[model samples]
Target chain A: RRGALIVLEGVDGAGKSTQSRKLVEALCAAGHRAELLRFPERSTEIGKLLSSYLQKKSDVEDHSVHLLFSANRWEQVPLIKEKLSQGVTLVVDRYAFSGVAFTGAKENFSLDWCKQPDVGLPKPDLVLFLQLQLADAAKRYENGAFQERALRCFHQLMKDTTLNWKMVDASKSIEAVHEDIRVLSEDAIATATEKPLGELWK
Target chain B: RRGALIVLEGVDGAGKSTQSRKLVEALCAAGHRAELLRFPERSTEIGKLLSSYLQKKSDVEDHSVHLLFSANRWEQVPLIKEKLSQGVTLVVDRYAFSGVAFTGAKENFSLDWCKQPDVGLPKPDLVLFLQLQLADAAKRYENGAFQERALRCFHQLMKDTTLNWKMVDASKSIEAVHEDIRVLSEDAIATATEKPLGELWK
Candidate 1:
């Protein structure tokens, strides 16, 4: 049997990085083979560029950045599948959702268009949307609206029933949130490899 | 009056770089305000990574590379438009057609899917297809089929008829090719500003 892919997605302050580590730690402590991966794996050649743009250390056009984000994920797909095949539960810090939501929030940018590049990637066995309200994102030009719109995109995406998408109010304490994530992830691991893995947005 | 976008496209051995510079020189000598540009700009933040990947100093998946290629162009769209609006004829070394041809030749990669990222980009006024017959390209692999498929795709794209795509006999000398491209480009520059800039594949 293969392993499950559990994705943690939301805005920056949503404790995605914090919770991702804890979940992986918990899974490992429980004697389960688990690993943590991230999108825009910023060390690769392509990722270095992604970093420069995100940090404003450099610039890239909006549409171009959108495609780059998708490429960032696509480049990691093979590694993602390899880990899962090795019976490792992969807890991703973020995935295609963040890519879609953030860029989709841009002015005149279409969610349909944003979703196209990431459509056929590997689907998550469980997507724990670290729902953070307070909430912002759309386009970089308008910081507030960008954050607001991006959060809304996450909300909209959570409604998709293709995969098991669970909304967790990230407003809680670290311990409390991790417990909920752990329980959900445990359930995900139970059936992770039962059937063949599916593609994203399928 | 907007200047035309004249593109030079063909395989690596097709003398694209050589002809692009010469064409730009010829255009300038003819008293035209022209500028030369190349795809995978290789200087922007994203382009450095493109360079690394193309140089075999780094690795990225085929799908990811394809998106990156599109992003590379997207980032330059503004620059392209600005130059055209300034009445500067932009002679490009490679453009979207090369992107589509190169990536579409990969096994199981759909040309339609390959074209999606670049669908809405600015259309070229004159695409001088520097037809190279000694050809190769499709993917990095199988070297021969990749080249053959890419060449075939180029041939197929030249038949689109949506734009003024002229086939240059690149099998001839550099001077001969330059003259052919010069005539085609001058004709293109004549009516370039007559119509509003159309989007690619519109």
Candidate 2:
């Protein structure tokens, strides 16, 4: 059977990244061949650009920036499939949900529009959306460069959704959150193998 | 004053890429500092994934793939802005147009939804849309591996209006087409310096 594709998404500061790492560690501990992939991957040429955007080192056109983010994932299609086919469980820190929710949160960009460029791409076996309140997310960036900007963007991302998404509580302690994600991961794997692939934000 | 942000858009095989190259060449010959950037760069780690998707070598979820593309572009924002600040013209072979149009063309994704994720991005000074009938575009890919697939995607891309777009005839001879592009370029430059950045995808 093909490996499961799992995604973690949530507002910035929701601790999704931390939970994602914890889940990966748990999967490895469970003897699963799991690998993690993160978006705005700064190592690549395109990722460098996304890094700058996040760092506020430069500015980009909204539509262009959004498309580039989508393109970046398209750039990863082969490796992702190869790993999955090789029996590797894939964990994504952020995938299309960020695109849908983050960009969808913005005005003038319809949820339907956010979901368009992603048609015919991979369908995740499970998507764990680490849900957090705007105030909670806002507090996470209390002391950082462009924290306000990040918070503003995160606020918008949380509200925009055209995909079928699941929400996970992010306000829990680290271990508790990890437990939540672990259960979700196992359930997602079962779902991936048991059911026909479901489309998110469809 | 900052140089204009220009985007070249259209269906695949509609000659947008060819025009993008020519426009950059023409801009440089005319002594403007111009640079060209392409989406799904196929030159980075993420880009490698996008290339596979185009080649049909792998399968990914649509929303995930779309966000990757946007991340790829966000990664490039600094340089794009830096170059523009230095009076260099930027020529993008494909940018937000593909983002909105391609995804918007897909089922389960609406144009408004497609446009949602791209808000607050830089507005293109000009978006030159290369318009051509499917027959004309089909002729360009007669010998390609994914001929049917590319053409079908192109058909979908043409019907989308998610950016500030201008339609142009692409079936004409290269020279004839270039002339029209030239006029458009000059006008764009002239207005970019004077006008405030306009609504994107208007």
Candidate 3:
């Protein structure tokens, strides 16, 4: 049986990091073969470059940065497939949707254009979008305009019928958000093996 | 007058480098403002990552590496547009075509999918395809299957009426190949200013 590919997506301070770890821990304790993976996966060669750019230790053009983010996820595809085929549930911190939401928020880069590079990647069984708290998001990004546009893009994505996109109120306590994510992911995990794995935006 | 955007594309041993330099020199000697740019540009952040992968200093998935190659070209858009607006004819050694042909030749990556990331990039006014010399190509790629597939992709790109595609016989002398390229580029330069710059596969 194949495994579920669960993704958590949101703004920088949306507790996705905290919940991804907890979700994996819960799955492991439940006797499921599970592991957590994160995007801008810093240990990878591409991820290392992404960190340098994100940490402001290097520079990249806006378009190039978006492509790099997409490439970083692409680099992890083989491993993602391997784990899933081996019946290991994979909880992802972020994926190409984050690339689209953040990069598409930039001027002159359309959300449509941003989605193209990642068209054929492995699709998630579930994507839990932790809704942003205005204060927390604004503080982290330091640009309200960018944060607003990115949030709009995420909302627009949720309207799509492609993947199982769930909305969660992240302004609540961390445990509260985790409970919401874990329940949905468990439901997804139950049926994930029966459904054929899919490609993103294909 | 906006300068012409000319591109030279072919297999590795197909005289692209030799002709790119000579074409610029020839255009300058004839009183035209001209410069040479090469893809896998090797000078920028994205290019540096690409160089590392190509040089075997690091590894990348086929899809990720292709996106990096596309990003390398995308990173130079501003400079390319600036030179063109200043009437400095830019002769590119290879552009998105190289990315498409080489990467698309790999298994599981279609030429159609390969072309998407580079969509909406600056389109060339003239694309001079330097036809490969069989012996030269075999020696460089060291694998006939790869060389043959790449050549076919180049041919497929030429068949499209998007750019001014001129097939050059590179089996001829260096001077002969240069003459063919220079003439086409000059014609392109003459008409380039009158025509608005177009986007690739838009």
RMSD of each: 3.4, 7.4, 1.9
Cα displacement (Å) at residue A127, model 3: 0.9
Error of 1 at A45 (Å): 2.7
Q: What is the interface RMSD of each candidate, in Å?
A: 0.8, 6.4, 0.7
lDDT of 1 by residue, B40-126 (tens): 899976788788888888878888999988999999999899999999989999999989998887787777778878878999988
* lDDT per residue as tens, model 2, B1-202: 7788888876668787889899989988888778888886888555777788768887655665666655556556667778877777788888755766566555666656555555445678877877776667867813343444444554555564654456778889998999899788877876755765444544
Stretches of candidate 2 off by over 4 Å are A138-164, A196-202, B1-202
* Over 4 Å off, model 3: A132-142, B132-142
Candidate 2: residue B60 lDDT (0-100):
55
What tens digits encode model 3's per-residue C-alpha lDDT throughout B7-71?
99888788899999999999999999999999989987667878878888888888999999998
> Which prediction has more favorable lDDT, 1 or 2?
1
Tens-digit per-residue lDDT, A36-64, candidate 3: 99988989777888898888898787888
TM-score of chain B of each: 0.93, 0.83, 0.95
Q: Which of the predicted structures, 1 or 2, would earn the higher DockQ when compared with the native?
A: 1
Docking quality (DockQ) of candidate 2:
0.25
Kindly indicate the candidate among 1 and 3 with the higher DockQ.
3
Over A1-202, each residue of candidate 1 has an lDDT whose tens digit, in order, gives 7999999988767788899999999999999999989877898767887888888887778899889889989988898889889898899998999998888888877777788788789899999887655542121023665667788888888778777888887888899999999999999899666977898884
Clashes of each: 13, 67, 0
Q: Rank the candidates by lDDT, best first.
A: 3, 1, 2
User: What is the lDDT for B87 in model 1?
Assistant: 93
